[model samples]
Target: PPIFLPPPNYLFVRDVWKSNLYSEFAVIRQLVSQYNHVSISTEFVGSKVDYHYQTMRANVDFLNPIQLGLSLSDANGNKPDNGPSTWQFNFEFDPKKEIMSTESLELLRKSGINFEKHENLGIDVFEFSQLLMDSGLMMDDSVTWITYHAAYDLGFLINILMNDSMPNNKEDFEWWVHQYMPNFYDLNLVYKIIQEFKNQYSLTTLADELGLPRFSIFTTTGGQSLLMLLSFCQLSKLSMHKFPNGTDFAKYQGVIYGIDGDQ
Candidate 1:
């Protein structure tokens, strides 16, 4: 069996926010328009807009309870604009019924979504995703709530849809993430600890000397520890060719071969 991956924590949120720093107004407007055309009631009654950042959230009460949230970034110290910047959307759905027509399931598979029926949720939790995609309301990348693990209320969000108890902390959250979606959690603690190692040492030598974590990472971003180790070696001007034999390239390059009997 493979190791379980933890859900996206505060660190992933920071990365997402940094990546999608667009205009808040444009995001909110598009969100409203997306839902309005689909017969879903959307009310944009609250927002938090400022120079640095902005967020707009709406309450949607149809087909059960839903919440639509959007956010824009202006962290570069520049004023917000409707430019090609980072933007993200979150959709919260509470479906009283989990039943889905066979036609819908066929449509979902034909669309290349490849969603599966998990044990807990009786309803097709991905039905809304298929609907939104089919209608061209929003593309997969724009829907960052689930795609990027940007959901701040994941505990409640998953509970309402799956009808399961919410995880209150990292331990339970990590278990849920692994059970629901493998390799979703980003293992950053490994890198944080590896940063304490001596950079001049080769990865093999470092791993042997420092006793760092040796688990394989299967996330979108490849193994963090491996990357950090390689980066450290590169920064120290160490060459892997000479690593196996424990030869110091820098010393070899600097050394002058003395002639026989020169002394």
Candidate 2:
């Protein structure tokens, strides 16, 4: 019998790193298929400032307004036969605005990003941000934001969403993420605890242990996103074997790799 699947809603994301990577905007693929893939760009930033917060990983409870409204969980109610639909997008920024790093850019090219094409074709970050804002996914408390070691992934996202600089510290970084995004799970943090003897496990290693795709050589940020969801799916299922029933992942929510603690 068809017995199990992921929660009905999620937004899995991945970002290509640039030195100014912290501020460059890119992509986020929602569980919804309306606009399955989106490539985003940023407005020019002029020495934007970061704001630090006083608390560390504050408990977040994002209330869904009028829970009965049409939502992704119900709207995208049926999971696909193949799996959740996967899409990829790039966050493009002004060539002039980005403070480039040849080393980092070199790493990105081999990994499959097309700089020239992105510079010319990526969507404006604000417009896609607006799309997400309107979709109600951003506010849906049940909507989970999943990523692997996702600080920079979120840094670029939060910056464009706020049209501001990265937060001054990890605490504020996490604070803003909770404010705009809900049911956030860093995957890496939870992995660290379960595999306590291990440290700094690469995405490839974890995927191998979980028997996921090799995670080798991807041309799109979306590919990484898909692998992440698969890993999370396996990890969640494995939890059922360990826990009395299944893990709710409540304790691991809101904890990013570097923000709350080490890997």
Candidate 3:
């Protein structure tokens, strides 16, 4: 019985990432690549050149949703009235108990997918959706149309992919990632994106720029997703938004989330 529980809401299960393929994937990859390299250089410079190469690592944890200890369904697959225990967050649209689709919520739960926590970072879907929806419900209609459209359409993308499962391996991880993690790419996507820019930029170009050890970039580059994840943290706007942020260092670094900036 962990007291830490996500807020009761629509609890729609969907991976916001898959939904934003063409638009944000490449951008994320590039951001991860750039920031990852910068962070490494900063740490290395601070540590001095002789910094005995102890260990290097890049963990793909999100790919393994089961390992994260997420519960696919609540013990009881039913919705409550308007208390904290209600299956979905109470929306004013219906007062006497007819606002949410309990059946829809239950269906996602039974499928072994946790909706409250899982989502994609590619197009800032969840962040945009949460902001728009909460803002709208609070009567923030003055909000612009493009922003709402982005959030709404992105949401539908997830709603369509609830049946999909989180990637559990390097291949699956790369596959979806290569498809829709972020737009500004890291290495893999960068190579395919701009063959002219391949290893042409100063960072990639400087790494012997040719052979030996392949000068392969790891954590930082792929770490672009980390940025998007961080943005998601800011978007959650929850008083208890510590899970997404803390999990980064506590559990593992650059594990979940993606590399995306508002720009």
Lowest lDDT sum, 10 consecutive residues, model 3, at: 37-46
Off by over 4 Å in 3: 1-164, 181-183, 187-263
| lDDT tens readout by residue for model 1, 1-263 | 23222222201211112123223333434543322211111111111122111110122111222222222221111212333222222233223345456676565345322232212221233443333334333323222121111222333334433444455444455455334333221112222223433342333344333333344331112122222322233323323423334543222211111112321
The local distance difference test score of model 3 is 0.24
Which of the numbered candidates is closest to the native, going by highest TM-score?
Answer: 2
Cα-based lDDT for every prediction: 0.28, 0.47, 0.24
Between candidates 1 and 2, the one scoring higher on lDDT is 2
The C-alpha RMSD of each candidate to the native structure, in angstroms, is 22.6, 10.5, 21.6
Tens digit per residue, CA lDDT, model 3, 31-77? 32212211101001003211211111121111111111000111122
Task: Return whichever of 1 and 3 wins on TM-score.
Answer: 1
Backbone clash count for every predicted candidate, in the order shown: 3, 3, 33
Best prediction by lDDT: 2
Residue-level lDDT tens digits of model 2 in 1-263: 13233443333233332232223222123344442212221212110122212221121111101000011222222234333244444445456644546776576666565667566655555655565566545655656666665554556567656755556666577688888776666767667666763335665567677664443422245555555555665666667524233445666776654433333
For model 2, the superposed segments whose C-alpha errors exceed 4 Å read: 1-79, 82-84, 93-98, 163-172, 197-200, 215-219, 241-248, 257-263
The better candidate by TM-score, 2 or 3, is: 2
